Amino acid sequence: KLSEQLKHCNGILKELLSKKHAAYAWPFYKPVDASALGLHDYHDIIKHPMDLSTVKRKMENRDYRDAQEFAADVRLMFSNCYKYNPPDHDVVAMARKLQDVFEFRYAKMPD
Amino acid sequence: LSEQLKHCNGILKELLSKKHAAYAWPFYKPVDASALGLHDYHDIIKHPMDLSTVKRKMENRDYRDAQEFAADVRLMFSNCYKYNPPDHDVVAMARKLQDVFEFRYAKMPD
Amino acid sequence: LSEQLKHCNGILKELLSKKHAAYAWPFYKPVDASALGLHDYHDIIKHPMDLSTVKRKMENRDYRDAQEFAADVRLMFSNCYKYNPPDHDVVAMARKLQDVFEFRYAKMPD
Amino acid sequence: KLSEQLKHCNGILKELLSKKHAAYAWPFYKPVDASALGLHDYHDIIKHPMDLSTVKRKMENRDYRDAQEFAADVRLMFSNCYKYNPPDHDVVAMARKLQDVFEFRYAKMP
Numbered sequence: 001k002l003s004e005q006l007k008h009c010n011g012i013l014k015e016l017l018s019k020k021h022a023a024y025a026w027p028f029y030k031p032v033d034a035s036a037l038g039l040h041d042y043h044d045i046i047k048h049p050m051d052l053s054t055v056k057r058k059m060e061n062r063d064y065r066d067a068q069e070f071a072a073d074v075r076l077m078f079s080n081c082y083k084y085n086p087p088d089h090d091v092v093a094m095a096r097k098l099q100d101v102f103e104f105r106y107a108k109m110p111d
Numbered sequence: 112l113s114e115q116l117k118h119c120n121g122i123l124k125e126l127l128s129k130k131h132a133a134y135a136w137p138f139y140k141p142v143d144a145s146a147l148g149l150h151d152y153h154d155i156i157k158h159p160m161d162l163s164t165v166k167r168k169m170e171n172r173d174y175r176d177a178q179e180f181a182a183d184v185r186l187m188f189s190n191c192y193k194y195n196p197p198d199h200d201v202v203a204m205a206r207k208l209q210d211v212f213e214f215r216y217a218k219m220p221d
Numbered sequence: 222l223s224e225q226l227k228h229c230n231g232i233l234k235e236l237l238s239k240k241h242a243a244y245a246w247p248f249y250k251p252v253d254a255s256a257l258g259l260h261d262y263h264d265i266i267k268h269p270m271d272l273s274t275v276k277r278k279m280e281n282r283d284y285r286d287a288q289e290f291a292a293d294v295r296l297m298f299s300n301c302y303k304y305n306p307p308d309h310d311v312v313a314m315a316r317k318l319q320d321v322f323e324f325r326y327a328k329m330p331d
Numbered sequence: 332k333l334s335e336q337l338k339h340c341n342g343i344l345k346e347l348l349s350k351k352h353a354a355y356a357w358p359f360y361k362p363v364d365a366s367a368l369g370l371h372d373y374h375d376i377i378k379h380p381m382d383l384s385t386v387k388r389k390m391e392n393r394d395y396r397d398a399q400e401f402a403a404d405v406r407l408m409f410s411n412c413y414k415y416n417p418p419d420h421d422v423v424a425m426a427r428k429l430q431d432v433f434e435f436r437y438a439k440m441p
């Protein structure tokens with residue numbers, strides 16, 4: 001019970017979670033564990049946390065109304081990363097590699 | 112807020128600055144499809160977008176908020192990804208410039 | 222019809238041609254408030270328009286009919302009359318170019 | 332019973348009918364007398380005749396919804412003239428002078 005756009009979004013999600021991107025996808029698979037890392041300010045700066053398993057949860061529950069909502073969550077995840085972090089951190093470069101995969105596949109969606 | 116649109120204007124200035132010219136130049140003006148020999152560009156890309164258009168819209172005060180500004184900038188990158196195969200030089204350049212944009216846009220005070 | 226929009230494209234080419242360049246040049250690109258130092262231009266003119274914007278809209282296929290094209294050209298001329306006093310050179314130039322546009326637009330098929 | 336905008340339009344119409352502009356307004360005071368002029372094809376080419384007396388009556392009867400509808404009638408009158416005539420005819424030059432008065436005053440509307 002998915003539209004053809006959201007079927008394509010599910011394909012993108014599946015692509016993002018696949019083995020070939022794991023080397024740069026892994027920091028986004030589960031929520032950032034800010035307390036464990038001692039990032040005391042993380043939740044003061046990031047008011048809407050997002051991660052790939054949350055997106056998956058939402059997709060499996062049929063919560064996305066259209067492709068634009070799916071895209072907004074995925075971009076939120078990357079934006080949180082860029083917002084919180086300095087430009088030289090490993091995680092920013094990993095975000096950028098994964099976002100290239102996302103944006104490119106998202107732009108090839110059918111009309 | 113005008114303060115949000117002011118910071119979007121700073122972002123736009125950054126994207127147009129000389130330091131990024133090596134990967135930003137293809138996005139300064141609309142794709143000249145007939146010069147390039149692209150008979151199908153306007154068939155495939157229904158809503159073209161480029162930095163000069165975003166400039167004009169910013170100077171005209173056409174953007175209600177930062178979200179509209181970002182939607183045009185991302186429309187520009189998406190058009191590029193949509194039209195092109197992944198190995199084309201312009202795609203590599205789009206990705207370099209989008210990294211500048213996304214990083215700066217995420218640091219916007221809100 | 223595409224034949225009416227094709228005729229509109231012909232008018233646009235006529236307005237951009239060298240023959241009219243002595244009076245058309247202020248309308249080629251958007252009014253550059255900065256270069257002119259006009260802090261109130263975008264306060265008074267809410268919807269700027271110019272010939273390159275019209276051209277980009279034509280290339281992008283944003284015009285649904287000839288009336289929409291005409292509306293933009295007339296908006297361009299109206300902004301100029303609105304902002305300026307009657308004895309400024311730009312108003313005389315606007316009027317000469319509008320005479321070309323209105324005449325050619327009146328000769329459209331159907 | 333007239334809005335601020337239509338009140339301004341009524342002011343415009345008064346100006347177009349005033350003695351000041353009579354030397355180039357007179358051919359538009361009343362319909363083109365095609366029998367008298369010997370124009371057997373005028374009503375084939377011009378499907379919607381329009382003159383300043385028509386606009387006056389519509390204004391008096393409150394048949395204008397808005398200023399845009401008013402503008403459309405006045406512009407129809409000028410377009411009919413440009414449509415039927417070659418560019419060197421005296422009536423075209425008279426139409427152009429009167430249209431300059433109209434377009435300028437219309438652009439100064441509240």
Ligand SMILES: Cc1cc(F)cc(C)c1Oc1ccc(C(C)(C)O)cc1-c1cn(C)c(=O)c2cc(-c3cnc(C4CCC4)[nH]3)oc12
Pocket residue numbers: 027028030031032033034036037039080081084085086089090091094
């Ligand atoms: C801390 C860290 C060191 C590295 F060398 C590489 C990465 C990816 C890295 O990031 C993470 C590692 C593990 C985990 C957990 C514990 C949840 O599995 C999360 C991250 C991590 C994920 N995301 C999305 C982030 O935005 C950030 C940010 C940080 C981070 C940690 N310390 C900082 C410093 C930089 C100034 C604050 N940022 O760590 C992560």
Ligand SMILES: Cc1cc(F)cc(C)c1Oc1ccc(C(C)(C)O)cc1-c1cn(C)c(=O)c2cc(-c3cnc(C4CCC4)[nH]3)oc12
Pocket residue numbers: 137138140141142143144146147149190191194195196199200201204
């Ligand atoms: C065509 C091309 C060859 C290169 F080697 C490098 C670039 C950047 C490049 O792209 C452009 C070069 C010039 C111009 C001008 C200045 C004429 O408007 C535009 C582009 C260009 C900009 N943008 C945003 C694009 O999306 C594309 C896409 C293309 C393009 C041209 N030919 C293709 C092939 C690839 C499949 C069809 N894609 O060219 C551009």
Ligand SMILES: Cc1cc(F)cc(C)c1Oc1ccc(C(C)(C)O)cc1-c1cn(C)c(=O)c2cc(-c3cnc(C4CCC4)[nH]3)oc12
Pocket residue numbers: 247248250251252253254256257259300301304305306309310311314
């Ligand atoms: C300023 C000016 C002096 C001249 F002698 C002739 C022209 C055309 C002229 O107008 C322009 C010159 C350059 C440019 C550039 C290329 C920078 O965008 C624009 C104009 C111009 C174009 N259009 C369409 C306009 O409506 C106006 C209006 C003005 C203008 C500048 N200063 C005024 C004074 C009078 C009201 C305040 N009006 O300038 C332009």
Ligand SMILES: Cc1cc(F)cc(C)c1Oc1ccc(C(C)(C)O)cc1-c1cn(C)c(=O)c2cc(-c3cnc(C4CCC4)[nH]3)oc12
Pocket residue numbers: 358359361362363364365367368370411412415416417420421422425
């Ligand atoms: C025919 C003519 C000769 C001139 F030397 C000057 C004018 C204004 C002029 O136009 C008119 C003169 C009188 C009248 C009367 C009062 C009889 O209704 C009408 C016109 C006239 C008004 N308007 C709005 C027009 O569009 C046209 C068009 C013409 C016209 C007459 N013959 C032509 C042919 C000649 C090649 C085109 N056009 O005449 C008028």
